[PDB]
Amino acid sequence: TLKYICAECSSKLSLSRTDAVRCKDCGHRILLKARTKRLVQFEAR
Amino acid sequence: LIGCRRAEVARTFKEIQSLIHVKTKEFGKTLNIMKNILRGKSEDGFLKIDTDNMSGAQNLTYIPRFCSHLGLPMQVTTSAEYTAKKCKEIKEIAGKSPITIAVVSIYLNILLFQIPITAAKVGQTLQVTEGTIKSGYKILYEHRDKLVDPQLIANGVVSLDNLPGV
Amino acid sequence: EVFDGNDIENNETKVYEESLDLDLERSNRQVWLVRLPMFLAEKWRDRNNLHGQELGKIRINKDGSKITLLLNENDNDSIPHEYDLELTKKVVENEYVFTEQNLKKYQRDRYIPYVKTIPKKTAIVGTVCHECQVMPSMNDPNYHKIVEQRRNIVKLNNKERITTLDETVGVTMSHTGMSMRSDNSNFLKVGREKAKSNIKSIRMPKKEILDYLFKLFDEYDYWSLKGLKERTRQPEAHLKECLDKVATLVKKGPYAFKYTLRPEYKKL
Ligand SMILES: [Zn+2]
3-state SS of C175-222? CCCCCCCCCCCCCCCHHHHHCCCCCCCCCCCHHHHHHHHHHHHHHCCE
Which residues are bridge partners to C134 per DSSP? C85
CA distances from B35 to B24, B38, B53, B55, C143 (A): 16, 5, 12, 12, 84
Contact C181 B18 (CB under 8 A): yes
How far B27 CA lies from chain A's nearest CA (Å)? 31
**CB-based contacts of C253-260 (< 8 A; 24+ apart in sequence):** C255/C222, C257/C224, C258/C222, C258/C223, C258/C224, C259/C222, C259/C223, C259/C224, C259/C225, C259/C228, C260/C217, C260/C221, C260/C222, C260/C223
Which residues of chain A are within 8 Å of residue B74 when distances are taken between CB atoms?
26-27
CA distance C15 to C3: 10
CA distances from B3 to B7, B9, B67, B82, C126 (A): 6, 9, 23, 26, 82
Helix (H) or strand (E) holding A33, with range, is strand A31-33
Residues 6+ apart with CB under 8 A from C154: none
List the domain range (segments joined by +) for residue B78.
Answer: 62-162
The answer to whether C67 touches C58, Cβ cutoff 8 Å, is: yes
Instruction: Report the 10 Å Cβ neighbour count for C143.
Output: 17
* Closest Cβ opposite residue B15 in set C168, C180, C183: C180
Residue C160 one-letter amino acid = E
CA distance B122 to B130: 8
State the DSSP string of C14-73: HH--S--SPB-TTTTSEEEEEE--HHHHHHTS-SSS-SS---EEEEEETTTTEEEEEE-T
- Chains contacting B with at least 3 CB pairs below 8 Å? A, C
Q: Tell me, rounded to whole angstroms, the distance of Cα C131 from its chain centroid.
A: 34
Distance in angstroms between the alpha carbons of the first and the last residue of chain B: 38
Length of chain B in residues, anyone? Answer: 166
Angle between helices C225-232 and C236-246 (to 10 degrees): 110
CA distance B163 to B153: 13
Domain with residue B127: its CATH number is 1.10.472.10
CA distance B33 to B40: 11
Residues 6+ apart with CB under 8 A from C206: C242
Q: Which residue of B has its CA nearest to C178?
A: B15
Instruction: Name the experimental technique.
Output: cryo-EM
The answer to whether C85 touches C133, Cβ cutoff 8 Å, is: yes
Helices and strands, number each (H, E), in chain A = 0, 3
Q: Tell me, rounded to whole angstroms, the distance of Cα C66 from its chain centroid.
A: 46
CA distance B77 to B110: 9
The answer to whether B114 touches B84, Cβ cutoff 8 Å, is: no
State the DSSP string of C127-161: EEEEEEEEEEPSS-TTHHHHHHHHHHHTTS-S-PP
Return the biggest CA–CA distance within chain C. 109
Q: Which of C168, C169, C172, C180 to mutate to test the interface with B (most CBs of B within 10 A)?
A: C180
Main-chain dihedrals φ then ψ at residue C54, nearest 5 degrees? -70, 135
Q: Which residue of B has its CA nearest to C182?
A: B18
- Strand-by-strand arrangement of the A2-6 sheet: A12-15, A2-6, A31-33
Gap from CA of A10 to ligand 1 centroid (Å)? 6
Return the biggest CA–CA distance within chain A. 44
Distance in angstroms between the alpha carbons of the first and the last residue of chain C: 53
Q: Which of B74, B78, B151, B155 to mutate to test the interface with A (most CBs of A within 10 A)?
A: B74
Which residues of chain A are within 8 Å of residue B78 when distances are taken between CB atoms?
24
Return left, alpha or beta for C162; rule: phi > 0 is left, psi -120 to 50 is alpha, else beta.
Answer: beta
The answer to whether C71 touches C56, Cβ cutoff 8 Å, is: yes
CA distance A30 to A22: 7
Which residues of chain B are within 8 Å of residue A26 when distances are taken between CB atoms?
74
Which residues are bridge partners to C86 per DSSP? C133
CA distance B104 to C119: 77
Q: Which residue of B has its CA nearest to A27?
A: B74
